[PDB]
Amino acid sequence: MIVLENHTDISGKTSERVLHSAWLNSHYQTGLKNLLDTAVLEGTDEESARSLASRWQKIDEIPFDFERRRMSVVVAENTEHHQLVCKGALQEILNVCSQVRHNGEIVPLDDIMLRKIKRVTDTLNRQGLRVVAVATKYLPAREGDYQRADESDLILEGYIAFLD
Fold first, then answer.
1. What is the 3-state secondary structure (H, E, C) of 105-160?
2. Assigned fold of 1-164
C-alpha cells in the first residue's frame, strides 16, 4: 500500500498548506487517476477534506499529459480570484516555477533556494520516498479556458512524499 508519509515546505518541515493544496489537486483532477493521489486523499483528515471541498469550487483543469508530466486544477472560493494548483515530479515542476514560499514570504527561486530544494529532495529520494512537488499561482478570474502555457511563474510550495 502506498502511503502519504510527508507533506512539507521546501525545507522539509511539515506544512498543512502543502497538504491542502495537494488534496485539492488530487480531489478535482480527472486526467490521470493514480495511486499517489489516492494516498493523498486517504492521508488527509475528513474534517479538512470536508472544509476544503466545500470552500474551493472547481473552475477548470489543465489535464495530465505524458510529455510535460504535470497536472493542474484551478479552484475558487469566490468568483473574483482563482488558485491554480499544479503537481508532478520535481524537475518538471521546477521547470515552471519562478518563485518559492519561504518562511511566509513569496521569493524568487534563486540559486540558494535551489540548493536547499536539491538537498531536501535528494535526501527524501535516498530514503526510498517518492517525491511529488506542489506549486501554485494566485490569479484574477478569467472567462476563457486554462491552457498548458498557464503553468508558468508558479510558486513552489513544497513536496508530498510517499512510502510503499
1. EEEECCHHHHHHHHHHHHHHHHCCCEEEEEEEEEEECCCCCCCHHHCCCEEEEEEE
2. Calcium-transporting ATPase, cytoplasmic domain N (3.40.1110)
